[PDB]
Structure formats: C-alpha cells, structure tokens
C-alpha cells in the first residue's frame, strides 16, 4: 500500500522562499542552550558537542511551522501520529547513543553503576544500573509521548470549546432581544475570556514543549560529555 | 575561500552533510525506513473498510470488489490463465459441463 | 468520534496497491540483472552485500519449526481476533 499525500506547508514554503531569498540575522532561538554547553572558561571537549545545533534548529523550525500555525482553524498537523513521532525521536536519540557507543570507551559507562563501594554490589548497585539503563529508553519514550499527548489534548479541547461557542452563539443570540439578555451577555463574555485564555495557553505550551523536546536530547548528550581543563 | 555550503551544489552538499556530518543519523533513518516498509506497509480490505475511507466505506458500490475484479481480469488476460483448469475448480472439465447442464 | 476525525491528513491524492510477491520478484530480477555480469566476481563485497543477507534470512525462514500458527500476512480480513483464517 502506497499513499501519496502532501504536507500542509506549501504556502509557508512559498513565504520562506519569498522572505529568505536575502540574508537576515537571527537573535531569538527557542532552545538557546544547544549553543552554550560550557559555562566555565578554560573547559573544552574533544567530542563534537556542537553537532546537534543544526538538527536542533531545523527541528524547531519544522515543529514551529506545524504546531504554532495549527491554532488557525482547519490547519492540519500532518505528522500527528504516535509512531511517527516515535520514529523521529528514535532516529535522534539512538543516533546520538550509537555515536557514544561506537567510541568504544567502556569506562564512559562506569557512572551507570550507581552508588559507592559501600553499597552491596549485587543487591543494590546492579539493580540501580538496570533501572538507569531502562530509564534511558523510558526518557526517549516519555519525550515522544509528551510531545504527542500535549498537542492531541490541546486540540481536542479547542475543538470542543469552539463547537460549544458556535452552538450558543448561533442558537441563543436572540436572547439579546429578550428579557434574559443579561444571562446571554454574561455567558458570551465568559466564552470570549475562555477563548483568549485557551489561545494564549496553547501558544505558550507549543514553544515550551519544543524547548523540552530539544532539552531531553541535549541532556542525553551532556550525560556522557567529559570536559578537560586548559593548562 | 572554499566552503561546502556556499561553493558546492545542492546534491553534493547533501551527500557531504549526510556522510561526514550526520552519517549515523542517516544510517538510523534508513534502518527505520526499511523496518517501516517491511512491517508497516500492508492494509487488509476489512481494515480499509473500517478506517480507510474519509466518510465511510460506500458498500452501495463496493469499489474494493471492482478494484480486485479489474486486477484479476488483467492478470488472467495478460498471463493467459485457464481458470477452468481442474486445480482452480477442483473438478474435471466434463464434470463442470455436467454441472452446467444440471443447474 | 467526530472530534477525533479532525486529526487526519487533509491532502490525500492517490493510493496504490501491490502484492509483496510481485515487487519482491521484480526486485530480485533487477538484482540478478545487475549482479549477473562477469565483471562483478562472486567474491566481490558488492555481490556478497547483495546476496548473503537475503540468503541468510530466507534460510532462517525455511528452518523455522514453530509449534504455533502464524496467520497469513496478506489475508482479506485480519481484524477478527477469533478467526486467524
């Protein structure tokens, strides 16, 4: 089975071509922490710790073109599928993990064995290592699940509230001309307030979820970075 | 001065980017694509009827049956298949003629 | 139900169907055509890359002896849990 379809970005692609045929500075970034990993001077890393910048920027651009514009009615999030997001996060996370593993430095994993020598190795430390190895994959799964569920719930709520607002506005506006106009006015004001609040909340939450999505990957990378000191 | 992004053409820069900048990511992506096309590229007729149509399966014309009919007609005509062969029918040609005369 | 239906791609244009047997056979024909010429010795890494993994997978499939039944991959109906056929 082969389905031919298109993304909902063609107009946005046209705008990108129109407005970026000439150079422009970028000073505001959703996830700025991918550029500044080291905060104490004289610390440097031999690992390609800045490899994630391009992917981070592209992912931010793609997800922002989709999610932020989805607040517009009838706009479609073409990628909104659980297993597709799983594939994306699998790609990124497993690629970085295999980059760390292909280094063939087993000592890098010494920190997995949690605790000190005082703790019993078999009954405490080994179980903790098992839990942490499991927790890495759980972090990947949680990242993708969170990204999916946030959008799904937000848009479900928006659709339901918009349906209710349409119903009351269309089939109960005549109350303005009736003696119970005050009740309708109060309800309409509440609906407007809820509309504004929901839109603001969704706008903020989309950006915040993208920030968290990139921060999980950056945390994965940072967990295995070692910094040398200049002398 | 020479820079990959400014001097090379788009295909060359693509190959360089995914071979010497993000090769592991490309490998993982190809692996995942192969998995998806090996295990997630099939849809049964019942599944199509349940979820495969925007407003619902139009049973009043059964387009799936027409599609399969065209498929099988094309296969038979092009491959010169004798659908009256005993293996297809489970009975000899003479028995088929007897049945036709009976019914 | 209706709110759930709003989360579908809105620009579906065409759907094409093809049997696994048919396109697998066509791919095998193409692979044989490109790996047949004499100037590609069987010991070349390219030829082994082309053939060995497929041979290994097919051998593993043939050797399989499972006590359970695996329903046909391409049935007409796979949505009934109580009817593997």
């Amino acid at each position: 089975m082969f389905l031919f379809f298109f993304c909902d970005l063609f107009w946005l692609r046209l705008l990108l071509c129109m407005y970026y045929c000439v150079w422009s500075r970028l000073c505001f970034i959703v996830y700025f922490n991918c550029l500044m990993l080291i905060f104490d001077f004289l610390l440097f890393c031999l690992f390609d710790l800045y490899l994630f910048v391009g992917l981070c920027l592209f992912l931010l651009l793609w997800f922002m073109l989709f999610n932020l514009y989805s607040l517009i009615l009838y706009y479609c999030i073409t990628y909104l599928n659980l297993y597709l997001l799983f594939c994306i996060v699998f790609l990124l996370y497993i690629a970085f993990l295999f980059l760390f593993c292909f280094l063939c430095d087993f000592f890098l994993f010494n920190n997995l064995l949690v605790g000190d020598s005082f703790m019993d190795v078999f009954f405490i430390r080994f179980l903790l290592c098992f839990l942490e190895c499991f927790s890495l994959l759980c972090r990947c799964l949680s990242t993708f699940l969170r990204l999916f569920c946030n959008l799904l719930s937000s848009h479900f709520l928006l659709l339901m509230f918009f349906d209710f607002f349409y119903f009351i506005f269309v089939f109960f506006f005549y109350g303005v001309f009736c003696y119970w106009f005050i009740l309708f006015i109060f309800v309409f004001c509440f609906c407007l307030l809820f509309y504004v609040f929901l839109y603001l909340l969704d706008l903020f939450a989309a950006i915040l979820q993208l920030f968290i999505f990139c921060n999980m990957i950056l945390q994965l990378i940072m967990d295995f970075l070692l910094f040398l000191l200049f002398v | 001065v020479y820079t990959r992004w400014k001097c090379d053409r788009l295909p060359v820069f693509q190959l360089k980017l995914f071979t010497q900048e993000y090769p592991m990511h490309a490998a993982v992506g190809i692996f995942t694509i192969i998995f998806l096309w090996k295990h997630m590229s099939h849809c049964s007729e019942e599944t199509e009827r349940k979820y495969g149509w925007w407003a619902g399966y139009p049973y009043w014309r059964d387009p799936i049956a027409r599609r399969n009919e065209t498929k099988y007609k094309q296969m038979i005509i092009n491959n010169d298949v004798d659908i009256t062969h005993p293996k297809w029918t489970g009975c000899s040609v003479e028995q088929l003629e007897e049945l036709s005369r009976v019914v | 139900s209706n709110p759930a239906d709003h989360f579908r791609p809105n620009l579906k244009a065409l759907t094409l169907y093809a049997e696994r047997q048919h396109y697998v056979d066509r791919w095998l024909h193409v692979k044989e055509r490109w790996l047949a010429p004499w100037y590609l010795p069987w010991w070349s890494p390219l030829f082994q890359l082309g053939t060995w993994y497929s041979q290994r997978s097919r051998n593993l499939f043939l050797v399989e002896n499972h006590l359970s039944y695996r329903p046909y991959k391409f049935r007409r109906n796979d949505e009934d849990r109580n009817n593997p056929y």
Binding site: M1, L16, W62, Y83 | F13, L17, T32, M40 | -
Partner: peptide, 29 residues
C-alpha cells in the same frame, strides 16, 4: 483515531524522512 493507526504508517513517515533528507539541506544552505 488515525494518530494511533499503523495501516499506512510508512507512507505517513515518508513526509518526515523527505524533510530530513531533502529539505533540511536547502534550509541549511
């Protein structure tokens, strides 16, 4: 729900893979 579906997952994910392998270089350059 299609978001939880898999009957056309491969074709659906081709969009992301095309974006990653073909559109990202253009945006990059």
């Amino acid at each position: 729900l299609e978001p939880m579906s898999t009957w056309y997952l491969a074709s659906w994910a081709m969009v992301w893979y095309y974006a990653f392998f073909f559109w990202m270089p253009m945006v990059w350059t």
